[PDB]
Amino acid sequence: MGDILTFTIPPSFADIFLSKSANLTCLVSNLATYETLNISWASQSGEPLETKIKVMESHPNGTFSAKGVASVSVEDWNNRKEFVCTVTHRDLPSPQKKFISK
Numbered sequence: 001m002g003d004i005l006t007f008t009i010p011p012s013f014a015d016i017f018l019s020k021s022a023n024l025t026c027l028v029s030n031l032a033t034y035e036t037l038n039i040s041w042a043s044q045s046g047e048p049l050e051t052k053i054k055v056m057e058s059h060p061n062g063t064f065s066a067k068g069v070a071s072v073s074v075e076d077w078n079n080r081k082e083f084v085c086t087v088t089h090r091d092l093p094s095p096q097k098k099f100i101s102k
Contacts (some may be wrong), residue, residue, distance in 0.1 A: 005030040006087045008100040011077070022077040024049065024070040024100060026085040031065075033091050034058060039068025040086045044099075049083065077102045 009025040016022050024041050031037060037058040041049040051070040058066040072083065082101040089095075 029065040041070035
């Protein structure tokens with residue numbers, strides 16, 4: 001508590017097989033201020049990724065965290081690419097960035 005935690009979750013081989021699209025998932029928890037929260041996904045090159053997020057506020061149902069789902073090409077995951085998620089809670093002076101790779 002009182003310290004913002006950011007973790008990234010990779011899509012499973014099975015999951016990618018079902019949808020035939022790889023998805024980037026970010027989990028942000030332990031928010032010192034459970035007011036509102038946003039999730040941001042971008043390519044390593046600093047290029048914003050198509051991300052779909054429902055509710056600009058963190059979800060207190062089942063979990064107390066927010067998740068951002070970005071749709072990437074299976075090719076990227078297959079080519080060992082890496083993506084960057086940045087969490088902007090405004091609570092911290094420096095947004096936390098996370099690297100994700102299969």
